[model samples]
Target: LDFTKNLLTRIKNLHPLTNKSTIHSLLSYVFSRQTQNIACEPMYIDYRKDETEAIIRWKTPLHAETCINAFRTQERKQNSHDDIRAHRKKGSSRPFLIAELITGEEEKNYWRMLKK
Candidate 1:
């Protein structure tokens, strides 16, 4: 289900409205470090999309928990392009950290789709 296509136009307005004012870690870099060696040169990764209405979803609550465990930052939101520009300058383009956990409830139909 993971497919990497050609570089699509970056969704600029899909910015993160982070709740940074409520966190503990001041280490922004922890959320903005490079994890791959790709060449499009991202700054900090923000919202990822499959080209429309939906935003994101972890495979399961466990996957969600694992991501939270690995990247433990209390602060949220990208604030500005500065987070993005910095990484591009260093040959380490990381996208900004947007939401920690996918907000809102999953649709009832989503659970029905699962293999019981």
Candidate 2:
């Protein structure tokens, strides 16, 4: 379900392909945080940093229905062309704002902190 086409293209142009650290960063950008959020919602937000000990501003409990309900959007899609269309069509209905959700991907860290 990855969508880093351009990133993949760049990865393909290398003679020996250096920078293993970023080889599939685009792929990571596309699939790393996404493997589990397909059916529940599509709004993958980038909160910059999540270094468990960085005093996360958005801390909350996972099982807490109220906390879990604060992060689900039903508008995620692929492709640069489709990204535009999705953004414009948002808010057709009220979105969920809770935490842990059944995104069909067996989330090992759903709403769990990254600091551990």
Candidate 3:
């Protein structure tokens, strides 16, 4: 949890200032990639300041109908790639956010970007 919080804090401090066009392009790209065969209805939203904080939530079998909390603020560097490198320099790792047919190595690599 500390690793998650620290990564989120650093991301909040370094998230880039996005413009309308850039936002539109990214959204469109995401839309383009999302298949028409799949569809989803709004259920929940978790906002974060930067990429690191963009962690999505999962509902366990015990609590499938619950609202989860998510997201904000502050500023620091113009880029967060350095923040990433900092974690890498120390050889730390993050935990898996989701579970599927994921490999142990992949899971280990998942949070390595955050040093958690």
Candidate 4:
């Protein structure tokens, strides 16, 4: 239950000027539209200024799952190698986003280690 509403997002090549609010709006819009316009507001977001990643806790486990599936589907349709090569050649710093569900055991282990 510890990770029921938690989702981990890895953002690669994030722009230096992108702020938390921008990230929030991006996730909100995508989740809402992907889930048939259902308002899947993120309950909270945890991000470190120095890291290009974030932990989003959604309103419900269902919403978290929906978001993960949406991103996974999009990822499957793209050729990752080609994408990376093209971006590298052009020297473009486009951000790539990935959403993953945080399992209960993984969450527990993280906290257990943090407390030590």
Best lDDT among the predictions, by candidate number:
4
Q: What is the lDDT of residue 98 in candidate 4?
A: 70
By the lDDT metric, which is better: model 2 or model 3? 3
Cα lDDT tens digits, model 2, 22-97, are: 2223223433233443322222322222111111112122212221232243232222211211222354342221
TM-score of each: 0.27, 0.17, 0.23, 0.63
Highest TM-score: give the candidate number.
4
Q: Order of candidates by TM-score, top first?
A: 4, 1, 3, 2
For candidate 1, write residues 7-112 as lDDT tens digits: 1112222124322221212122332342222222222232433321122333344433433433444323334333322222233333433334433233333333
Instruction: Sort every candidate by lDDT, greatest first.
Output: 4, 1, 3, 2
Clashes of each: 8, 10, 2, 0
| lDDT against the true structure, each candidate | 0.30, 0.25, 0.25, 0.56
- Specify the poorest-scoring 10-residue window by lDDT in model 3: 66-75
Query: Of the pair 1 and 2, which is ahead by lDDT?
Result: 1
Question: In candidate 2, residue 102 scores what lDDT?
Answer: 33
Worst 10 residues of 4 by lDDT: 77-86
Superposition TM-score, candidate 4 onto the true structure: 0.63
Q: List the residue pairs that clash in candidate 2.
A: 42-76, 52-115, 67-99, 68-98, 68-99, 69-97, 69-98, 69-99, 70-97, 70-98
Clashing pairs in 1: 42-93, 43-94, 44-94, 44-95, 44-96, 45-94, 45-95, 45-96
Clashing pairs in 4: none
lDDT of 4 by residue, 80-111 (tens): 32232112224344545677777667666654
Distance from true position, residue 76, model 3, in Å? 23
